[PDB]
Specification:
- The chain has helices at residues 4-16, 60-74, 91-106, 129-140, 185-188, 205-224, 245-250, 306-310, 313-323, 348-359, 389-403, 406-416, 472-490, and strands at residues 25-33, 44-47, 79-85, 112-118, 148-154, 168-171, 175-179, 197-203, 231-235, 261-269, 328-333, 363-368, 417-421, 441-445, 449-453, 463-470.
- It has 13 helices and 16 strands.
- The protein starts with a helix and ends in an 11-residue tail after the last helix.
- It catalyses: a 1,2-diacyl-sn-glycero-3-phosphocholine + H2O = a 1,2-diacyl-sn-glycero-3-phosphate + choline + H(+).
- Its EC number is 3.1.4.4.
Length: 501
């Protein structure tokens, strides 16, 4: 089957990051979207799972996620690989890890386990790696002796604000769950106003790709444990750090196919792991038109650093994904814009790509977290804009840089853009009083190809990861289970840009 969208993205990645192919990004064939029996769209893991249910009393989506995480870990024979934003997995997420590992050990196995979290310089870790390890060992009981733990918290750049933001659970290098969902008790589980989020589950070669990505992070992490300012590390049973757990598990034989889905795994190394891809001949003309509303204090890695692109293929993968749209693009995000300063307000190439689509008559929908969501720098669901106008005005500006006419700009913008704040029911706010918050990092194109992962479209220089799938069948499921419902309710909070009927 043809894969025109993957092909274009692959061209972009091989131009940007040829040396990172097979570690930080990889295209594979023969994957399977991992859905349970009798639930074919079940590979798509939404939380809390309450479309058109303002009460959201049951939260079946959350229960399904935790259930699936537990089952995947229960099935482990050799390796369990977990990454997240700090804190270390707690509440029901930790229960899933403990229960799964206990089952694995009960089934005769001695799993190796890596648990990696990223921490901002201003973030204080309450439960540090040694204490988290001890806590797990306690919960594991007699099984602890059979489980090899590596637990670490990391920060790769203090000045360039870089640390792990990827959200992965990879088992035996053959199943993978990834997406926007942080294993954080207080965002999804113990709360009356749960954040809306999306993960996906797959099996096959692309799971190994995810594993190879975590090996790249742990190679750095293990080496830089020599600097406690950057890395805090704790192991159990006197075990060594395990930089290449996934490669050891992979061995020499190729990953076996589990289905027929083609996938590009793609991530990024942020700042402070690797300065550039030395084999890259990537040579872009980086944007000349600077944001007329803000100036970055920090060096702009998003908009003005060639080297950063070469070790962050995910940035260009998202841009080329959007650029591959021939009919329509849906963007579902926490934010399209970042708080500026210290970060650039937006990714210029992304916005220019979008403007290009609008001008060409390609339908563009952007749904973001309601600006009413003001949280601290670290929290999921918060908004980094005061009004949806900050998105449409920027598109208008870029449209004007493109068409040379503001009337031309208006016809493109007003005729082809849908722009709204996220809603999941007819209710505007939870019974909580608090507004609905969106944590998606999702892009879907032509109901054919889509990204689900941890990489936000708003500027951030973190280590992130995600999958891009090309499958009309799978994208149909995404449309039905997530995108059509999102718009059914969110259109009630749609924006009408300035200069539009």
């Amino acid at each position: 089957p043809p894969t025109p969208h993957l092909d274009a993205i692959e061209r972009s990645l091989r131009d940007t990051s040829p040396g990172l192919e097979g570690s930080v990004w990889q295209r594979t064939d023969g994957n399977r979207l991992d859905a349970p029996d009798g639930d074919p769209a079940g590979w798509l893991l939404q939380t809390p799972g309450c479309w058109g249910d303002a009460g959201c009393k049951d939260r079946a989506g959350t229960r399904r996620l935790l259930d699936k995480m537990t089952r995947n870990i229960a099935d482990a024979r050799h390796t369990v690989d977990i990454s997240s934003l700090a804190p270390f997995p707690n509440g029901g997420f930790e229960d899933a890890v403990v229960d799964g590992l206990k089952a694995s050990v009960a089934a005769g196995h001695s799993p190796r386990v890596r648990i990696l979290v990223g921490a901002a310089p201003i973030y204080h870790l309450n439960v540090v790696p040694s204490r988290y390890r001890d806590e797990l060992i306690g919960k594991l009981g007699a099984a602890a002796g059979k489980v090899t733990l590596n637990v670490a918290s990391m920060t790769t750049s203090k000045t360039s604000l870089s640390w792990n933001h990827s959200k992965l659970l990879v088992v035996d290098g053959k199943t993978a769950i990834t997406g926007g969902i942080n294993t954080n008790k207080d965002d999804y589980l113990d709360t009356a106003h749960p954040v809306s989020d999306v993960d996906m589950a797959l099996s096959g070669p692309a799971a190994r790709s995810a594993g190879k990505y975590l090996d790249t992070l742990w190679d750095w992490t293990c080496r830089n444990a020599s600097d406690p300012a950057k890395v805090w590390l704790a192991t159990s049973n006197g075990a060594s750090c395990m930089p290449s757990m996934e490669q050891d598990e992979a061995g020499s034989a190729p990953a076996e196919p589990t289905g027929d889905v083609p996938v590009i795994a793609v991530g990024g190394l942020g700042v402070g792991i690797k300065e550039s891809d030395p084999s890259s001949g990537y040579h872009p003309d980086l944007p000349t038109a600077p944001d007329t509303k803000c100036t970055v204090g920090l060096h702009d890695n998003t908009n003005a650093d060639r080297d950063y692109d070469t070790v962050n293929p995910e940035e260009n993968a998202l841009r080329s994904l959007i650029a591959s749209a021939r009919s329509h693009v849906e963007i579902s995000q926490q934010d399209l814009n970042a708080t500026c300063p210290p970060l650039p307000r937006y990714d210029i190439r992304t916005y220019d790509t979008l403007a290009g689509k609008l001008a060409a008559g390609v339908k563009v929908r952007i749904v973001v977290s309601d600006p009413a969501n003001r949280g601290a720098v670290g929290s999921g669901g918060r908004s980094q804009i005061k009004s949806l106008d900050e998105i449409s005005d920027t598109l208008r500006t870029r449209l004007v840089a493109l068409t040379g006419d503001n009337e031309k700009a208006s016809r493109a913008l007003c005729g082809n853009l849908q722009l709204a704040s996220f809603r999941s029911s007819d209710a505007a706010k939870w019974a909580d009083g608090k507004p609905y918050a969106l944590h998606h990092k999702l892009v879907s194109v032509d109901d054919s190809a889509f990204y689900i992962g941890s990489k936000n479209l708003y500027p951030a220089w973190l280590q992130d990861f995600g999958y891009i799938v090309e499958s009309p069948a799978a994208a149909q499921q995404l449309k039905t289970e997530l995108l059509d419902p999102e718009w059914k309710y969110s259109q009630q909070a749609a924006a009408t840009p300035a200069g539009c009927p």
